DNA sequence: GTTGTGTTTTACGAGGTCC
DNA sequence: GGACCTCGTAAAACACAAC
């Protein structure tokens, strides 16, 4: 705990790209995106959790 | 050029599901 | 008995208004 570190443009690109392809992360694509983005698997799992909330919220 | 103040983006854990 | 996602929460870090 904690501390709040925003994700860079490059990381989000990669994360948004895979999400646009499949909303849900696999274990294999998770460890691929980690290597490519240098983000932790945990961070990635969390961003995905939070990204689904957003897609849900934004329906309006 | 900065004080208002929403809203959004990262964490995390109780609560419950699926192996 | 951990891996994991419904929602809830908390606070960083924006995004606008304004005088």
Numbering used by the authors: 217 to 276
Copied sentences from the primary study:
To elucidate the mechanism, we performed structural analysis of two homeodomain proteins, the posterior homeodomain protein HOXB13, and the parahox protein CDX2, each bound to two distinct high-affinity sequences. The optimal sequences for HOXB13 are CCAATAAA and CTCGTAAA that differ from each other by the three underlined base pairs, whereas CDX2 binds with high affinity to similar two sequences that begin with a G instead of a C. Two parts of both HOXB13 and CDX2 DBDs interact with DNA: the recognition helix α3, which tightly packs into the major groove, and the N-terminal tail interacting with the minor groove. Instead, thermodynamic analyses of HOXB13, CDX2, BARHL2 and MYF5 revealed that the two optimal states were bound because of their distinct effects on enthalpy and entropy, principally caused by differential stability of the water network at the protein-DNA interface.
The most remarkable difference between the complexes is in the conformation of DNA of the HOXB13-DNATCG complex at the position of the divergent bases. The DNATCG backbone is bent towards the major groove, facilitating contact with Arg-258 of the recognition helix with the DNA backbone. In contrast, no water molecules are visible in the HOXB13-DNATCG structure, despite the 3.2 Å resolution that should allow identification of strongly bound water molecules. A relatively large solvent channel (6.4 Å in smallest diameter) exists between the α3 helix of HOXB13 and DNATCG while this space is occupied by well-defined water-net including Arg-258 in HOXB13-DNACAA structure. The electron density in this region of HOXB13-DNATCG structure is low (σ < 0.5), similar to that found in the surrounding solvent, indicating that the water-molecules in this region are highly mobile. In contrast, no such interactions can be identified that could explain the preference of HOXB13 to the TCG trinucleotide. The absence of ordered solvent molecules, and the lower resolution of the HOXB13-DNATCG structure is consistent with the possibility that the TCG sequence is preferred because it represents a relatively disordered, high entropy state. Analysis of the mobility of water molecules at the protein-DNA interface revealed that, while there is a similar number of water molecules in both systems, the waters at the HOXB13-DNATCG interface are more mobile, consistent with a model where this complex has higher entropy than the HOXB13-DNACAA complex. However, as predicted, the CAA site displayed much higher change in enthalpy, and larger loss of entropy compared to those of the TCG site. These results indicate that HOXB13 binding to one optimal site, CAA, is driven by enthalpy, whereas strong binding to the other, TCG, is due to a lower loss of entropy. For example, one of the HOXB13 optima, TCG, is affected by DNA methylation, and methylation of this site further increases HOXB13 affinity.
